[PDB]
Design a protein around this ligand. Structure first.
Ligand SMILES: Nc1ncnc2c1ncn2[C@@H]1O[C@H](COP(=O)(O)OP(=O)(O)OP(=O)(O)O)[C@@H](O)[C@H]1O
Ligand SMILES: Nc1ncnc2c1ncn2[C@@H]1O[C@H](COP(=O)(O)OP(=O)(O)O)[C@@H](O)[C@H]1O
Ligand SMILES: [K+]
Ligand SMILES: [K+]
Ligand SMILES: [K+]
Ligand SMILES: [K+]
Ligand SMILES: [Mg+2]
Ligand SMILES: [Mg+2]
Lengths: 332, 330
């Protein structure tokens, strides 16, 4: 058997769905193939651990678990070091690169994106700037800092009025999912949206609004990633999405380009806007997308013939490969 | 107030981090130090009341190693310290720290991401190419032909995430380029190859959080063209000049470029911007460094001394910026 550790919970608003995700992942892992330990991070930051999961998780209640951090991750309960650590955290303090940096300092192998890819895909501005260098189409947008807005509010609003068309969307640069995002139908709502998002962040983006369908593509791999056929979020899903053949192939190639633009590893989900006349814009990539048994990312791969337990195993094997390829770097 | 100095690191710049730590300790508070060996082992020594006489005497649970400290001051160079990794550990433990955050340290260490962000900011750069080890094995031929068609010999092959000129080689033709690529791949999975330029090498120091300030530029006056590892730390044939012999408008251009490069990676605390200036007065930016060296051969402290900010004041100012940034997070 191989030794795996699941990390879930976290100082997050999505604390409960991370626990729900852990139940689906734990119940999908073949216990005869993997020795499984779990680490539960409470809403206060305390780390708690339970050893050797051998039965099915019957309720999300029993995953609420009620030693130092380096000791919990260093050794499996079998005594050996873990072969892979699978974090299932969402939002800030989870997919922002911090816990990945902790994994790197402690030299533990882990599933998913690394420090650079997680942090660059989290920051809305950096994400768009790397997409633009790659040549990916994006909606017109403006960005500025809180310091600049305190002094140049008049000039910033004049640029928005000229370059963009209403409605517009105001988004904080480094916050959680749908946290501080406001659709603004006039300039009065625009200024109120800027004040709301600056109350918790120092950097802002303002996007041109678009009338389009939301199409998503799932990517899996390290150095030779593969993309799925696209799906749509009608939350109800439609897999595969009803698209023209040339749009389906364009989106799969763009998802591979977005994966490379942020130097991703393991997985990513590329979300697009597709209008009625087949105009394509990339919205964002998700370093740790929804991973429940009914989420879009696993269902997109099920349509490709990859089952949920096989997807979990493939991500673990990618974690081992990325760790091995890191050791062959010289550091002396 | 209690400060903790972290130095060493699992990095090819290990010895440089030790030399940087000696001067920061000798010029700086209740001071504790943590020595990370070249293999990644943490070793702590409490209370440095006396003066550090040699680099040799600095060859000495992580959560318990970190009254709690008012600020932790990392002096790590290169991977596993200057690339966002140890900054993420500080974030999880909710401990204030000096310098750049997770994203800023990571995006400035990776020279490819750095160049792409500098390009979007509008900064001038030399023509370059980048590729992964996986791509070079399946596409070696057209990659070497892309160097011939897009770049111009001589070229400089570099690992993406390193410093102190480790892994860099100047290649005058395709035969030397193929050896430089094989050598650079020993340090990283990703490379950058730049068109070479004949130019003077100028550096500018930046300091601050939401309102950074930049110094006057200085020049690395040298006889050799390649400022390699031996030229940087092994012998004193190279002389620094602060400020540099440049026109007033050229010096002001370099300050404004350093501020834009600081903001291009959303820097916090400090950064050092390095430039190339040709004989016909053309300007390219080379790189920025999230934690520049503080060795006797370094320039970041000397650049701020010329501004009237002495060495002990520079250390204190960096600690204040760390406490300010931490309070804004909480
Ligand atoms: N395109 C180029 N043209 C001419 N010289 C170059 C070029 N690229 C690199 N060099 C030489 O290599 C040296 C190091 O370059 P670079 O800044 O890329 O490496 P580094 O290790 O990041 O530097 P540092 O030690 O400051 O971190 C420079 O001082 C310069 O002399
Ligand atoms: N420019 C836009 N035009 C139309 N709808 C948008 C635009 N930007 C965001 N939205 C809507 O807002 C939702 C959240 O936007 P997104 O940037 O994905 O937030 P997050 O990254 O926090 O999930 C999306 O599902 C989308 O439907
Ligand atoms: K994102
Ligand atoms: K750098
Ligand atoms: K030539
Ligand atoms: K340099
Ligand atoms: Mg979204
Ligand atoms: Mg450097």
């Amino acid at each position: 058997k191989e030794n795996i550790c699941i990390v879930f919970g976290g100082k997050s608003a999505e604390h409960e769905v991370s626990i729900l995700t852990a139940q689906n992942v734990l119940n999908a892992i073949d216990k005869d193939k993997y020795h499984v330990d779990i680490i539960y991070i409470t809403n206060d930051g305390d780390w708690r651990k339970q050893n050797n999961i051998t039965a099915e998780i019957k309720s999300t209640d029993e995953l609420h678990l009620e030693l130092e951090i380096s000791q919990l991750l260093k050794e499996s309960s079998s005594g050996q070091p873990y072969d892979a650590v699978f974090p299932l955290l969402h939002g800030p303090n989870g997919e922002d690169g911090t816990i990945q940096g902790l994994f790197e300092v402690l030299d533990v192998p882990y599933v998913g994106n690394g420090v650079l890819s997680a942090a660059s895909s989290m920051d809305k501005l950096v994400m768009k700037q790397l997409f633009e260098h790659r040549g990916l189409p994006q909606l017109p947008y403006i960005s500025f800092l809180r310091s600049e807005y305190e002094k140049y509010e008049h000039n910033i609003l004049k640029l928005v009025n000229d370059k963009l068309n209403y409605p517009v969307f105001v988004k904080p640069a480094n916050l959680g999912s749908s946290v501080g995002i406001s659709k603004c139908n006039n300039e009065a709502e625009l200024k109120e949206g800027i004040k709301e998002a600056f109350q918790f962040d120092r950097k802002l983006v303002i996007e041109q609004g678009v009338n389009a369908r939301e199409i998503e593509v799932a990517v899996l791999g390290n150095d030779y990633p593969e993309a799925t056929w696209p799906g749509e979020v009608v939350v109800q899903l439609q897999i595969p999405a009803d698209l023209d053949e040339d749009v389906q192939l364009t989106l799969r190639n763009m998802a591979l380009e977005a994966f490379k633009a942020t130097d991703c590893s393991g997985l990513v989900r590329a979300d697009f806007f597709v209008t009625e006349d087949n105009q394509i814009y990339i919205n964002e990539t998700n370093a740790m997308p929804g991973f429940t048994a009914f989420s879009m990312y696993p269902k997109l791969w099920e349509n490709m013939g990859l089952s949920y337990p096989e997807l979990i195993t493939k991500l673990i094997e990618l974690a081992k490969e990325r760790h091995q390829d890191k050791q062959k770097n010289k550091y002396k």
